[PDB]
Amino acid sequence: RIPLQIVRAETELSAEEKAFLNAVEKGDYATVKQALQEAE
Amino acid sequence: RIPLQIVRAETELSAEEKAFLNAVEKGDYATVKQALQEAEIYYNVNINCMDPLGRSALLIAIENENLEIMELLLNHSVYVGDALLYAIRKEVVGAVELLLSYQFSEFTPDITPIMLAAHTNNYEIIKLLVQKRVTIPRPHQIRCNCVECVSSSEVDSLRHSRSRLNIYKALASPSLIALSSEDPILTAFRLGWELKELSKVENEFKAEYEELSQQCKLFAKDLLDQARSSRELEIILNHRDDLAKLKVAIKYHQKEFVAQPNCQQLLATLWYDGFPGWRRKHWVVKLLTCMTIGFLFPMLSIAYLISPRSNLGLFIKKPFIKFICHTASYLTFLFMLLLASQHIVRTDLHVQGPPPTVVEWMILPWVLGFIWGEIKEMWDGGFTEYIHDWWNLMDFAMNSLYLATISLKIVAYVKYNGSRPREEWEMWHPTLIAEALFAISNILSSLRLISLFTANSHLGPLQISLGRMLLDILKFLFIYCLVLLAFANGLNQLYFYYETRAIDEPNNCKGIRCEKQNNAFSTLFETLQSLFWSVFGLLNLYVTNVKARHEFTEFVGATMFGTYNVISLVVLLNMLIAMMNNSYQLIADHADIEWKFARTKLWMSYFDEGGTLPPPFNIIPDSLIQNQHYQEVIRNLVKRYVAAMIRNSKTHEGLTEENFKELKQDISSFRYEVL
């Protein structure tokens, strides 16, 4: 009776980075362009 | 001519329910919506309607991996029970997230979502579940008498065993181990050991526990193969909870972990301390170096005794040099044993109690050193480990025989003083008994030299294979002994009426060790000896004849002997050969791993600084930083292993299904945009 946790935790990225990665994976020639403009 | 019907009929649903299920299966975001509206208003459709093959609308949508219908049904408050398990088994992360966002079943009622995810070994779903603070029950000891275990085993043994197996199968998941354990290697070692021990207590479910232990061992090895540097390898191998982790792996019987090429290279580097580029040299020069180092064994030892810090005294501290010196010392002892039984050094065979000769005086210190070394090793190193070697038994028997020989010689020297012809000595003379014991101990000590074969690349695997077949030889011995006892009983019963005294036999010799064999079946002991010696053809055929002319008895005895010969020499030996072949076929596959494990065990015994001197000369009188380094290396290894396994998971079936689903989604989106 011992709980299970995460020992070697990974530093997650922000919602902006997650959205950028999602757009890159899905494929959007314009959404990725505007995301890069926002990053700039 | 009998018709076929349906016996276990299923209660069919109405046309409304059939249409609703058809619409759900086909996919219609509006038709299903209006059907749910109709079910809400007029109750024409059951929201909890079930397929005859136990497949609700939510299950159909889950198997269709379309999330819009599932979200709408969840908003409509449909029975959602036991759907997360279907999503987990189908291994659909989006659907699993959707249900996690808030009768008849294909799953046993003890299965939890975390246990099912662990059974699947999906890292992405296991991490998602563990992120929400889930727990897993842990079972009781292998041999537990607590009331709760006894009651559970007394009410539902099938349920108890299935639950235990499910819990262990979940705990033995490589992804769960990597995600939730801080020492994955040690956890795999311990879990594999526990599963191997449990497989023989639950003999019915033996194969499942065996496969789980094999899985744990494979995980530990594959984690080890992800090291990229000698520094990382040394950090892994030297971590103390000098090669502590390697010693733990040896203790837990991790043969594939130990025999990995990176570990063997480190061990060889440690083994050849004083011979850089040993494999660069020719076999001839290596052989000559072996001989020269062997001959200088009395020196390098006196040097170590009189000046350990000197340049000469530090040579014997190397493992290979120590091994060579010990081998040379043992060979010298065996050569003196050979010299003991010669005409040059031993004469005057007529004395009752003889003083020890020069060869025996030279022999005694070696025996004392052997006994002292055995006792010292047994004290320092663990008493229970001393018996799990199967060579220490030979050592114990040999040393006991030597002690008995010395005691009998002393007793004879004390008791007897004078001379007497050897032909008129009694049967149990102490000198005779001591000589017999000395000969037996000589045989054992000469046979001990087998254990040095594991150090050679050609003889080691062969020796391991033969030692592996010995157990099945022992298995056949039982049946042979039973058959021998049966036939000995019969023959002795038939022939015990015709015993004769040694006076009436020629040369006054009685038994089967005479030139004319007689009285072969007069006693049980003699019958056993005769039936043993008939296996090799050393018993003559006229031993079945009695002095009187009892032809019926002689024929019955001859038929008994012939039946025994047929059964023993035509059937049992050929069956032994067949099963020897079968055993060797399986043994020959893993010869390299077993040989390397044995050689590693042999090498590791010369690394420590205890017992450096051979037996002839051995009777003369921070943690936190290491933890952080280990954690960093473990992080790197786990990341590399997970990435490699993920890239290996790319399969044709999965890629085809993903491409088909994506093409269907894009086609539907384009059709909707056009419409």
Ligand SMILES: CC(C)CCC[C@@H](C)[C@H]1CC[C@H]2[C@@H]3CC=C4C[C@@H](OC(=O)CCC(=O)O)CC[C@]4(C)[C@H]3CC[C@]12C
């Ligand atoms: C069959 C007759 C000649 C036996 C005579 C007895 C001894 C002269 C023999 C018996 C077993 C031999 C040993 C068997 C194996 C080895 C390991 C061997 O080590 C290697 O081969 C290391 C290199 C490698 O790994 O191949 C060094 C010699 C040695 C100790 C041998 C030395 C000579 C021994 C003691």
Ligand SMILES: [Ca+2]
């Ligand atoms: Ca020993």
Ligand SMILES: [Zn+2]
């Ligand atoms: Zn219990």
